[PDB]
Write a protein that binds this ligand. Structure first.
Ligand SMILES: N[C@@H](CCC(=O)N[C@@H](CS)C(=O)NCC(=O)O)C(=O)O
Ligand SMILES: N[C@@H](CCC(=O)N[C@@H](CS)C(=O)NCC(=O)O)C(=O)O
Lengths: 229, 229
């Protein structure tokens, strides 16, 4: 049976999966779990995914509860022999290493800042603390791009899809004026037709955060190319 | 050339890699990076791994900066066709999904609690908050063990090696009296000869945390079997 994706498009890891689904033209079923209404605690969803997180994928008897596993699974089943999840071991391990940087470092710090803002209100967040932590992630990604125009090498991989959604989300708040390779990479990712799958949920997240957090993101921070405007 | 592991054995993800290296009898080189003295910021290590984290593995030109990538890489190179990282796609995706639970959920919450304790002192930590967050991880792992005696099924996998080190670390602080399947699994993991590679660094972490945090872990919390005593 075809895969079922449980999602809230405001979530960056969800958007990474939506981008892969569009890029590979995968036929999936969709289920909307509204995180800002606590629907991830609904008894059937919680029994499915005890971590109460999106994205979640059901594919026959296989239940995946992490975007990075979903990206790998979908690439292996719907892009066998492709370049997004390369067959060469060293190349594949570099993509895996970068998926784990997204999970462990970039998303962790984005999520800490955004979660604090929803729970406490923007006025009660240590914004300078979060600016340092997220700028530190920008420094790292600028270094990852020193010798290549994509995160894992000269070609688009799953790592770019995982990172770009969270990067777009961080960049609602923190500008890309001092990270030229990162800004150029983001600009290039915005020209991909698959990037259209990031746009609705990024904008919904922007509006939801400004409402629930009682603030406005700095209008100058977000990088918005002509194609996406 | 043989792999080089950069490590501090106090780190649970480091200990997962030490356990795999012992289990598979892998010949690696070792480099000690003392995290409690800031040696992860030494210029050569920071150039190698901009995330300033252990474990880091150098294997020829391949540089891995995440325990979960290291576990997968080492299983693929030193246990090809084995059961720790199974070849069957659905089984492999279940192990991957659990490695990502360790990264995203269990380690995130352990690290938040332990990092707060080092930075602020135990007296300045919201222990009840961290107890709730880590008990929630215990609830999830008890559910993962409802139908199997290892985390991903009836056999030891990389998921057990990744999870047991962080679980042992959480359980210095929070008891396993209300999580019987999880306690039984931990007791079983302690009987594996590879578990000996967890013991020195768990004890060093216990002593370092009590010194730097100015507290004592509850002596009753840790589960310590006869083999490990
Ligand atoms: N490592 C996970 C992170 C998933 C995650 O934390 N998603 C958030 C939204 S960005 C979520 O579902 N939050 C709801 C909750 O934790 O209750 C992945 O990559 O899928
Ligand atoms: N997701 C990473 C986590 C690595 C990590 O954060 N390790 C800690 C020790 S438990 C570290 O090196 N901390 C030093 C620092 O962040 O400066 C992995 O699995 O390797």
């Amino acid at each position: 049976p075809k895969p079922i994706l449980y999602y809230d498009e405001r979530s960056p890891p969800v958007r990474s999966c939506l981008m892969l689904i569009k890029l590979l033209d995968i036929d999936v079923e969709l289920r909307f779990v509204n995180l800002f209404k606590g629907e991830q605690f609904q008894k059937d969803f919680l029994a499915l995914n005890p971590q109460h997180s999106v994205p979640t994928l059901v594919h026959g008897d296989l239940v995946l509860t992490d975007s990075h596993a979903i990206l790998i699974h979908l690439a292996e089943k719907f892009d066998e022999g492709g370049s997004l999840w390369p067959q060469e071991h060293a190349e594949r391990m570099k993509v895996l290493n970068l998926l784990l940087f997204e999970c462990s470092f970039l998303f962790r710090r984005d999520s800490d800042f955004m979660s604090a803002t929803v729970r406490q209100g923007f006025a009660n967040v240590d914004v300078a603390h979060h600016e340092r932590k997220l700028t530190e992630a920008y420094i790292i990604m600028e270094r990852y791009l020193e010798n290549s125009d994509f995160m894992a090498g000269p070609q688009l991989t799953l790592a770019d899809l995982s990172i770009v959604t969270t990067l777009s989300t961080v960049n609602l708040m923190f500008p890309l004026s001092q990270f030229p390779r990162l800004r150029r990479w983001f600009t290039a990712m915005q020209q991909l037709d698959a990037y259209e799958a990031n746009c609705s949920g990024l904008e919904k997240l922007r509006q939801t955060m400004e409402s629930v957090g009682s603030f406005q993101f700095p209008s100058s921070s977000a990088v918005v190319t002509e194609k996406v405007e």
